[PDB]
Amino acid sequence: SIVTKSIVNADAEARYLSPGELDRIKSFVLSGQRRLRIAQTLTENRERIVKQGGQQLFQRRPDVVSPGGNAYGEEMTATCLRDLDYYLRLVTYGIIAGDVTPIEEIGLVGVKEMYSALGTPISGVAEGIRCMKDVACSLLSGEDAAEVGFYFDYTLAAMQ
C-alpha cells in the first residue's frame, strides 16, 4: 500500500516522514471512501468481467484454445479463466491498497518463470488481462476508469 512503502522509504533513510509523505497518507485515507466503492463494483462483477474477459481473449487468440493450445479442452479452459479470476482479484487489492504492491508480490514477481515453466504463452495471458480491462473500464465512469484501467496496464507491463 501507499502507507507501508511510504514508511519503509522513510525507514531506510533514518528519518521520519516529510510533509510530502504525510500529506498523502492524509490524502489517501480521505480517498479511502471512493476506493471501496470502485473495488465494490469489480467485486460482484467478476461473473461478467471474467467471462467476457475470456470472451475477447479466445476471439483474439484462438491458438491457445485450439487443439494444441495450452488451454485446450474443458479442463484447461476452466483453468484458463481461473487465472483471470486471480488477476481480477489482485486488481481489487491494488485499488484498495492504492498501489500495485499487492499485485507486485502476488502474480507479478517471477511470473515469467511460472508461465514459461507451465508451457503457457505469457503473451497470451497478457492479452487476457487487456480484454478484462475494456470490460472493467466499461463498467465505471471516466474518473474511475482512469484508475481501474490504470492497474491493469501495469499488470500488462510487468507481464511481458
Binding site: 487489492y93 504492491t101 499487492p102 507486485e104 508480490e105 502476488i106
Partner: protein, 46 residues
Amino acid sequence: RTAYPYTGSGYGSAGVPYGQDTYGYKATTAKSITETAAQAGVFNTF
C-alpha cells in the same frame, strides 16, 4: 484458513514471521557430543 501456514512478510504472507520466529538462520543451541551426554546423566561411563 489453511493450517500449514508459512513465513515471510509483506503481501503474500500468512501473518507468521519469517522462520516462525523472525530468524532465517537460527543459531544452534545444542552442545557437542560428549557434554550433551554429560547433561543426560545416563552416559556417565561412556
